[PDB]
Amino acid sequence: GSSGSSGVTLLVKSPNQRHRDLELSGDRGWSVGHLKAHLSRVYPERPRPEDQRLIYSGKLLLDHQCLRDLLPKQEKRHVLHLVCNVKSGPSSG
Secondary structure, X not given: OOOOOXXXXXXXXXXXXXXXXXXXXXXXXXXXXXXXXXXXXHOOOOOOOOOOEEEEOOEEOOOOOOHHHHOOOOOOOXXXXXXXXXXXXXXXX
16 A cells, blocks of 8 residues: 555435534555544544444445455545444433
């Protein structure tokens, strides 16, 4: 994986489950699995990299997959869909 320019802009959108978007870097060298974590950061909440559901145009992302392969090689910017998933909450109260 020989690459080194700057990175790609990933538009972290939400499927009407939070609203608002977030544009972060998505270097073709990055890793879905890694990105997640990286996201959890920029994301105000500190979610999990295993929970963070990375989707691209509906197509759910894995983790080991590279953005290079995922993202195209022509278009500009990208619109991702990071779905946050907790682990049950303390109902009532």
